[PDB]
């Protein structure tokens, strides 16, 4: 609580299995490392009933999904949200 509110969603990893990624019902992704359980940024997520995620294989993109039907993609090499996607009815 690394701050999450409820039932945590998918936990993802840096390509090397480090810097794990998590969010839950709370609208934020935390990217935190292993043992050295330190945060690099708050990857604010969707205001979803619940969120969801996968990260592009290169570890560059956080695909922020969730129970609501807005979808957005993050660029981890920048730390910006790239943008909120058109989405067009997708509670991914």
């Amino acid at each position: 609580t690394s701050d999450h509110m409820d039932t945590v969603s998918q936990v993802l990893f840096h390509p090397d299995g480090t810097c794990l990624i998590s969010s839950s019902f709370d609208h934020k992704i935390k990217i935190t490392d292993i043992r050295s359980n330190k945060l690099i940024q708050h990857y604010n997520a969707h205001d979803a009933q619940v969120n969801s995620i996968s990260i592009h294989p290169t570890g560059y993109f956080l695909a922020s999904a969730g129970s609501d039907s807005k979808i957005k993609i993050w660029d981890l090499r920048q730390g910006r949200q790239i943008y909120t996607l058109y989405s067009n009815d997708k509670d991914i």
């Binding site: 701050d3 330190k38 945060l39 690099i40 940024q41 708050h42």
Partner: peptide, 24 residues
Amino acid sequence: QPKLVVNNGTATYPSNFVPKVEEE
């Protein structure tokens, strides 16, 4: 950068909590 906001921030809340609690 926003991680530095977390740095107390939230760091002392958990201990700011604690005293008083058992006394009650």
